[PDB]
Amino acid sequence: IPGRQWIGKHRRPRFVSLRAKQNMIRRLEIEAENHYWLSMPYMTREQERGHAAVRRREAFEAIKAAATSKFPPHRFIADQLDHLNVTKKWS
Amino acid sequence: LRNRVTDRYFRIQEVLKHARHFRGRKNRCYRLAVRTVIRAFVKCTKARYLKKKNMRTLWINRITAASQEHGLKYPALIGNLVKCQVELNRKVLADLAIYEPKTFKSLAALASRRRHEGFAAALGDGKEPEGIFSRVVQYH
Amino acid sequence: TKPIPREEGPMIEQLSKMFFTTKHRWYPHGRYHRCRKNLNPPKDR
Amino acid sequence: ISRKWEKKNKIVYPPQLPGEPRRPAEIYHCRRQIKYSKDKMWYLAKLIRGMSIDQALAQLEFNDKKGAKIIKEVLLEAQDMAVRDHNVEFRSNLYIAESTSGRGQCLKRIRYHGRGRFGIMEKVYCHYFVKLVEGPPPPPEPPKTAVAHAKEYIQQLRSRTIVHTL
Amino acid sequence: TARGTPSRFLASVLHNGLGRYVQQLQRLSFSVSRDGASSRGAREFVEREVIDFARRNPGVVIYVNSRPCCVPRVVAEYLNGAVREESIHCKSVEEISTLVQKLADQSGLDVIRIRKPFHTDNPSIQGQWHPFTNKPTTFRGLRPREVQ
Amino acid sequence: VKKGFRAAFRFQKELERQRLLRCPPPPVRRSEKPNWDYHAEIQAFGHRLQENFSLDLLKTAFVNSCYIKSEEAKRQQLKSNQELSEQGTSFSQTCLTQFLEDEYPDMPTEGIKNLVDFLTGEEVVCHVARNLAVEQLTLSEEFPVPPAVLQQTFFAVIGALLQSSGPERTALFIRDFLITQMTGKELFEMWKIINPMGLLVEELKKRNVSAPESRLTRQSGGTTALPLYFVGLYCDKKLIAEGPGETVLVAEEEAARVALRKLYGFTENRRPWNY
Amino acid sequence: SSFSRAPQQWATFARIWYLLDGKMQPPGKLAAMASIRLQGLHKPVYHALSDCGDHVVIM
RNA sequence: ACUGAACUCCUCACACCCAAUUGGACCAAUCUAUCACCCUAUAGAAGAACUAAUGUUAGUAUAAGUAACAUGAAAACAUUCU
Ligand SMILES: [Mg+2]
Ligand SMILES: [Mg+2]
Ligand SMILES: [Mg+2]
Ligand SMILES: [Mg+2]
Ligand SMILES: [Mg+2]
Ligand SMILES: [Mg+2]
Ligand SMILES: [Mg+2]
Ligand SMILES: [Mg+2]
Ligand SMILES: [Mg+2]
Ligand SMILES: [Mg+2]
Ligand SMILES: [Mg+2]
Ligand SMILES: [Mg+2]
Ligand SMILES: [Mg+2]
Numbered sequence A: 001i002p003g004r005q006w007i008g009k010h011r012r013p014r015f016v017s018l019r020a021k022q023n024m025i026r027r028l029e030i031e032a033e034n035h036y037w038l039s040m041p042y043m044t045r046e047q048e049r050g051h052a053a054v055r056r057r058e059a060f061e062a063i064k065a066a067a068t069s070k071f072p073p074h075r076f077i078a079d080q081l082d083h084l085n086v087t088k089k090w091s
Numbered sequence B: 001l002r003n004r005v006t007d008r009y010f011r012i013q014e015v016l017k018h019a020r021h022f023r024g025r026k027n028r029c030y031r032l033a034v035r036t037v038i039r040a041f042v043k044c045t046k047a048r049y050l051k052k053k054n055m056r057t058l059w060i061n062r063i064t065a066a067s068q069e070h071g072l073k074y075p076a077l078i079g080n081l082v083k084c085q086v087e088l089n090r091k092v093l094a095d096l097a098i099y100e101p102k103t104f105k106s107l108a109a110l111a112s113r114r115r116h117e118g119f120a121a122a123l124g125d126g127k128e129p130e131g132i133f134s135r136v137v138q139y140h
Numbered sequence C: 001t002k003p004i005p006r007e008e009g010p011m012i013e014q015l016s017k018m019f020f021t022t023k024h025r026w027y028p029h030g031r032y033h034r035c036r037k038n039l040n041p042p043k044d045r
Numbered sequence D: 001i002s003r004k005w006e007k008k009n010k011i012v013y014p015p016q017l018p019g020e021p022r023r024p025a026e027i028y029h030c031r032r033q034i035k036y037s038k039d040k041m042w043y044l045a046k047l048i049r050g051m052s053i054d055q056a057l058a059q060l061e062f063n064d065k066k067g068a069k070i071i072k073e074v075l076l077e078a079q080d081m082a083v084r085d086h087n088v089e090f091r092s093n094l095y096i097a098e099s100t101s102g103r104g105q106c107l108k109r110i111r112y113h114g115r116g117r118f119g120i121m122e123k124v125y126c127h128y129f130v131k132l133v134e135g136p137p138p139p140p141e142p143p144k145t146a147v148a149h150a151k152e153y154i155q156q157l158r159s160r161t162i163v164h165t166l
Numbered sequence E: 001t002a003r004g005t006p007s008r009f010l011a012s013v014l015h016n017g018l019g020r021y022v023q024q025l026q027r028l029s030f031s032v033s034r035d036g037a038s039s040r041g042a043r044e045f046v047e048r049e050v051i052d053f054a055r056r057n058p059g060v061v062i063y064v065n066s067r068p069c070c071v072p073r074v075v076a077e078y079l080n081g082a083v084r085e086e087s088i089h090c091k092s093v094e095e096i097s098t099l100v101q102k103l104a105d106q107s108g109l110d111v112i113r114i115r116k117p118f119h120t121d122n123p124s125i126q127g128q129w130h131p132f133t134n135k136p137t138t139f140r141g142l143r144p145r146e147v148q
Numbered sequence F: 001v002k003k004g005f006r007a008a009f010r011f012q013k014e015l016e017r018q019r020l021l022r023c024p025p026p027p028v029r030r031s032e033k034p035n036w037d038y039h040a041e042i043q044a045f046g047h048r049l050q051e052n053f054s055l056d057l058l059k060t061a062f063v064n065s066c067y068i069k070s071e072e073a074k075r076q077q078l079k080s081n082q083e084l085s086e087q088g089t090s091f092s093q094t095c096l097t098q099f100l101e102d103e104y105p106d107m108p109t110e111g112i113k114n115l116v117d118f119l120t121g122e123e124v125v126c127h128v129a130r131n132l133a134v135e136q137l138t139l140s141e142e143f144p145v146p147p148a149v150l151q152q153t154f155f156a157v158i159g160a161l162l163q164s165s166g167p168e169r170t171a172l173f174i175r176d177f178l179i180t181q182m183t184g185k186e187l188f189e190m191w192k193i194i195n196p197m198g199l200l201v202e203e204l205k206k207r208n209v210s211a212p213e214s215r216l217t218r219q220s221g222g223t224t225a226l227p228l229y230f231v232g233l234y235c236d237k238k239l240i241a242e243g244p245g246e247t248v249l250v251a252e253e254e255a256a257r258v259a260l261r262k263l264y265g266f267t268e269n270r271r272p273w274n275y
Numbered sequence G: 001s002s003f004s005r006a007p008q009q010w011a012t013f014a015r016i017w018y019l020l021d022g023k024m025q026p027p028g029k030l031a032a033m034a035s036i037r038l039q040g041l042h043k044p045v046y047h048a049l050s051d052c053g054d055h056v057v058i059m
Numbered sequence H: 001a002c003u004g005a006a007c008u009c010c011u012c013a014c015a016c017c018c019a020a021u022u023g024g025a026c027c028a029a030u031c032u033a034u035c036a037c038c039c040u041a042u043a044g045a046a047g048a049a050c051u052a053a054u055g056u057u058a059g060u061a062u063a064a065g066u067a068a069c070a071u072g073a074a075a076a077c078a079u080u081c082u
């Protein structure tokens, strides 16, 4: 072939087998059923308005509150004194 | 030199103990052994996928051969053992194909029986009584 | 049922013709391959 | 420098029992700093590695190489110390079990080339190692016949297992 | 890797499960320094846990040595003569309880690669395949292009 | 000269490990090495196998006679082993013939006697006792322990457990250690025989059945160096066995062996041992 | 079943001479069957390193 | 219909596949302080880690036992001859 098979002006040919046709067809059928089930909403756009504003508001209060509660951890005496047991002996 | 390295023999021996069976100077010289030991470890991890793959294609070769002994082919055998809710896998069916060939012959007769119930089932379309081995067990 | 009835070149052609295999597995292999062989392999079963 | 080969004639064994075969003697002799190279000594050392000492003396009296006379000096000296020091009764009853040759401490001289450039010659020295063993020489290994190859192939066929299953 | 390391087949010691189960671990040998931070969690293991461990399985005999060591060790010795020496150097008490319980649970087989994940010794019950299974005989045992 | 101690110490130990793996030391017995308490280890031997002994009697069970002789010869500058071993080999032979005569009723008594000569032989018993920590606890003269001594101590432990907890717990002990050594083993790898065809003819005469025809069923490669034959053995036109072979004689004798397995219930497909 | 070790092993791996008439037959469709019976791919004991092929005579 | 992935499911375990860059957890050996005492611990320090600079120095390979090199002849080693 003139150069680098798959890019360029003179590319080598590639042909569509029966595998690739049946694959593309069953993808189109799954797609067309997605086109069926998106054609019938349970609400209009007026009816859905504000139906989850409370839960979205409380969810962002949870994210906002998790953001504004970030601070260094507590420092204890028992950890620092607990280091002293590295020279614990027997007798 | 204030502190220069003393423990260096053991790092060389960490790498070189994996090279003890190589050819050439790869078993001896550290510069060559690092490349071939790294490379042997990369092949060692990428060959786990190939171990699983090659075992499975080896099982499909064994199930294919022993099902050609009973007149069936591989896709009729596997598809029609699936359609009986006998969900044995490829490893077990290859091991029955080798060690217990009466059981594999009875699985071949069960799969070909179900295949002919599928042929006579799709042949006489419309409402007809179902096959006996064509019944499914409903779980709930 | 049936009843029971009652030189290196030439030697490697004779063994190859005898066991129906090619000539190459009859020529020997050197010390490096004789001494990588696991001489006490694991038995099973 | 290591000189471990002179020590090997010093290993004393405990005295044997009545119920034990007679041990063959072993005689370790070597010469150091032979002015000859270590791989021209390999051919003469390799030549005599299983022959008896009378056969090896016969093969080294008539070889044109320089090392043959020196190896014949080593073998005559090890035959004499074989008889005197090591309790080997028959002079003829000795075969060369080991005849190797390492490298010696070499020197470095300057070889002048065709311009200001040059090279580094080495004045090459070598050693020569010998273990003689009391006894007849071992027989040469017979080449394996079609019976041995047939039994080896069939033994491999009997060896094999159904693999990657139970 | 697996080609540089030896391998073995999956076995047991003396058919370790068939009749009865026998604990395969004979001796543990702790060597624990009295004064030394290396064997601190070993000492806290001897003060706390080696007695309850020694009672939970009485087929194991335990030798705490308490010498001035600089790295503490535990030496598990198994019924088949295998001796696995592992270090408890600077390990906490819980990690020595899991380590000693790990040595107790296993056996004196090598920790080299195991080839097959299973070991039948009677693999075939209906008779193994040979090429004359699944081949029908013919009359008088005749072979092809044989007349009589 | 690099200053330090730790690489010199570790390399000193790896020189020690190469000095070991170059010149391996002779095997010293376990009692002559540290971390040994012989009484605590007899008690651990008792609790390890899950039974109870009378511990002084197990102490007499591990003490040989050659150790007593060499110990007296070292006194110049204890009860022996024979009794408990005698009781243990008498009882172990009787329990192995009870278990084998019950679980294989079709066997001849010659074959059962040779199976008990396998299960109480030195290869099996010496294989069992080296993995039950018996060899470490035997007080003997030479090391490593000779096989007849270690067999004598093994049946000393069996007779000791007879006097400890009666016949039935020893019957379970022999059930769980001596019988499990025949699992996966052929009959004629245990009861080794010569000329199975004549023995098969006598076994057919004891069932009052006419003499069998050896009869070539299937073959392959008859003129090559790798033949294969399946000789069957018919008995009034009904086969008892059929076996393969590289020649015809090998397949005939091996079909005689398959027929002997099927007459005795010692097939490959027999009901396994019940535990 | 109930063989010994070596006769069972010899029986499993012994190779079988096949005959195969090729009158009025295409050579590639004979070559498929001859190829399968030469590699041992008609055996469930097949492995590429067990040397379990057979002999095929095409007349 | 089957085959077919590191995708997904399955049993157990999960921090454990990017350049330049950046954040973090550990850490070999050495010395110092103090423990320790068949080779360690907590810190403090620093000439603190090399499969790569036509790197430097030393060793030994390869090319290779290769290219190249060298003694006129006989004899009594007095001599003679070319
Ligand atoms: Mg191109
Ligand atoms: Mg040079
Ligand atoms: Mg898959
Ligand atoms: Mg994934
Ligand atoms: Mg994860
Ligand atoms: Mg530090
Ligand atoms: Mg630096
Ligand atoms: Mg370096
Ligand atoms: Mg680099
Ligand atoms: Mg460099
Ligand atoms: Mg050279
Ligand atoms: Mg030359
Ligand atoms: Mg050249």
Ligand SMILES: [Mg+2]
Binding pocket: none
């Ligand atoms: Mg020249």
